[PDB]
């Protein structure tokens, strides 16, 4: 593979993604800032108008995820650990308008927040996706409170669907259920790192860390329970009752040594044929680039890239330009950008 | 892959070699044995008359090697962990005569050791491997006292080359050079835990637990510092790379031209894509069965064969699709 080095200097970046025609791209800093990119012009300063954070462990800014329509709407998503009371904290959506000139993130309101807030620095998810009528997915973290990611009326350990306004739709699987969460899509999750539109399938494909071995990757249906954690490839933990469990539903993939799976993109691009329907995942603890060779749902085959580099991958998206895009995560983290053949 | 567990008990198997003619598989576990293997009849007693080994740690008995000729000569090389008399160990090899019961080594003689003993329990290599002319080559680790891999006159980092007697081939890089060891070929080495000669270049490949941390896999030249040398591959984060074999059957055509290495820390078998000297692509196989795999050996039959590295270890045979 090739690997051209864009950015340096990125304070633990933790998600990029694309502008449309030659725009740039977004990064987001967890310490709490967020930044554009550009070919020509290198890296913007912090753009204003971004929510103050909880930046404690694993918490602060989070996701950047533009608007289907930023072309027309130029709105721009983020996910953030926001700071509750009692010291903990909890995963939060908002949106807003990007200005014209790119300085100032306008407006900014969440529009979701998790409840209640029981995070203490670790597992508060963050992954957004947008399926293909626009409705948003926000992956869920249990926030390090094992039980909850099994309670309906808790938003731990969940996948949740909304409006593109953060509105319940009105047909989730537990609209009108007493003590069960409306915005709820699936539960029984740990504390996903990935989230992704399979475009050709149109599902969503998400991924989890599991403790100490067991990550997962899993095709979340909904008001299905995802096991965790009654059902772990990890370990064995209290709660557990083996790796399968009857009324939970078992993994696509899993591994039983952990890679620290982080970031997820399918490439769909005409660039590297040979990389097309594949699923690109990172991996933190194992500092490299996972690839899955895809045959319909089915994972036929694992192949590892950029393991001589000795960085963790935090992200992985399939650029408009047929290229990969990552982000590495340390103090001096990177932007990097991938191909496969020349 | 297909697998087929073929045997189970075995205490930390280390290496495994097959004897011609399907007369079976010859297997060494770490704590002090050595076992014949039969498709037919399992697992035999342990064959006697063994060298006595230094069982800490990563040492014990560890390779064995039929010679070449074996069916006419019955020859069978060891190589182990051999105690000192000040508490330290070092990689020794010998070899002795398989009797034709099948029950003891003859006359077992030692034929290299490392000198000095530097290791209490670690890197101590131990693969071995002939090249086409009959050579054998000979992995040793550092026995964890880096500085020496670099020291031309010291036994520890290095790849060895002898005959088959254990001679010093007048051809050697250092020979007649002075305040250096005869016996080296390449030095700069770690901890190599991998051996292997490519059957379409006659080259010696080696793979190790390499000097700037994690792992890697060279063509190692004679006379060369692998540190300077630099790795056809790198893994910056170890798999624990153990055992290698380069796939050249008929059996499965999609696996023709690639390498095998077992992943210790990772627990996987690992695929190394190849064209020519270069490695394209690496493939992750086995992962679902949780096994440290020790050795990789390609087979006779167009399988492949691994040990795991357990206190209940394994025997697999491993095919495509
Ligand atoms: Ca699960
Ligand atoms: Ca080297």
């Given at each position: 593979?090739?690997?051209?080095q864009?950015?340096?200097?990125?304070?633990?970046?933790?998600?990029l993604?694309?502008?449309?025609?030659?725009?740039?791209?977004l990064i987001?800093?967890?310490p709490?800032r967020?930044?554009?990119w550009?070919?020509?012009?290198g890296?913007?300063?912090?753009?204003?108008?971004?929510?103050?954070?909880?930046?404690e462990?694993?918490?602060?800014?989070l996701?950047?995820?533009?608007?289907?329509?930023?072309?027309?709407?130029?709105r721009?998503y983020?996910?953030?650990?926001?700071?509750?009371?009692?010291?903990?904290?909890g995963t939060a959506?908002?949106?807003?308008?990007?200005?014209?000139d790119?300085?100032?993130?306008?407006?900014?309101?969440?529009?979701?927040?998790?409840?209640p807030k029981?995070?203490?620095?670790?597992?508060?998810?963050?992954?957004?996706?947008?399926?293909?009528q626009?409705?948003?997915?926000?992956?869920?973290?249990?926030?390090?409170?094992?039980?909850?990611?099994?309670?309906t009326?808790?938003?731990?350990?969940?996948?949740?669907?909304?409006?593109?306004?953060?509105?319940?739709?009105?047909?989730?699987?537990?609209?009108?259920?007493?003590?069960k969460?409306?915005?709820v899509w699936?539960?029984?999750?740990?504390?996903?790192?990935g989230?992704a539109?399979?475009?050709?399938?149109?599902?969503?494909?998400?991924?989890?860390?599991?403790?100490?071995?067991?990550?997962?990757?899993?095709i979340?249906?909904?008001?299905k329970?995802?096991?965790?954690p009654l059902?772990?490839?990890?370990?064995?933990?209290?709660?557990?009752?083996?790796?399968?469990?009857?009324?939970?539903e078992?993994?696509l993939?899993?591994?039983?040594?952990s890679?620290?799976?982080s970031?997820?993109?399918?490439?769909?691009?005409?660039?590297?044929?040979a990389?097309?329907?594949?699923?690109?995942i990172?991996?933190?603890?194992?500092?490299?680039?996972?690839?899955?060779?895809?045959?319909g749902?089915?994972?036929?085959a694992?192949?590892?890239?950029?393991?001589?580099?000795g960085?963790?991958?935090?992200?992985?998206?399939?650029?408009?330009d047929?290229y990969?895009?990552?982000?590495?995560?340390?103090?001096?983290?990177?932007?990097?950008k991938?191909?496969?053949?020349?």
């Open positions: 593979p090739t690997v051209s864009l950015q340096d200097g990125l304070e633990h970046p933790w998600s993604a694309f502008l449309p025609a030659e725009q740039g791209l987001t800093e967890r709490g967020l930044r554009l550009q070919q020509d012009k890296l913007s300063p912090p753009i204003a108008g971004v929510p103050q954070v909880y930046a462990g694993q918490g602060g800014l996701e950047v995820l533009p608007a289907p329509d930023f072309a027309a709407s130029r721009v983020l996910s953030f650990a926001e700071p509750g009371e009692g010291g903990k904290a959506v908002g949106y807003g308008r990007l200005s014209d790119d300085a100032r993130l306008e407006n900014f309101k969440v529009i979701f927040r998790q409840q029981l995070s203490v620095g670790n597992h508060f998810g963050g992954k957004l996706a947008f399926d293909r626009g409705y948003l997915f926000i992956a869920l973290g249990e926030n390090n409170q094992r039980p909850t990611a099994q309670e009326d808790k938003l731990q350990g969940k996948l949740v669907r909304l409006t593109a306004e953060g509105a319940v739709p009105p047909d989730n699987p537990w609209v009108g259920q007493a003590g969460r409306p915005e699936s539960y029984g999750h740990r504390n996903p790192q989230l539109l399979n475009p050709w399938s149109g599902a969503i494909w998400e991924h989890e860390h599991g403790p100490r071995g067991g990550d997962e990757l899993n979340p249906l909904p008001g329970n995802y096991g965790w059902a772990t490839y990890g370990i064995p933990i209290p709660e557990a009752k083996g790796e399968r469990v009857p009324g939970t078992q993994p993939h899993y591994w039983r040594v890679p620290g799976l970031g997820m993109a399918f490439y769909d691009g005409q660039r590297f044929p990389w097309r329907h594949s699923l690109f990172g991996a933190l603890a194992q500092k490299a680039l996972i690839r899955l060779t895809l045959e749902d089915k994972v036929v694992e192949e590892r890239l950029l393991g001589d580099r960085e963790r991958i935090r992200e992985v998206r399939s650029g408009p047929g990969l895009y990552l982000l590495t995560d340390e103090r001096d983290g990177k932007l990097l991938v191909g496969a053949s020349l």
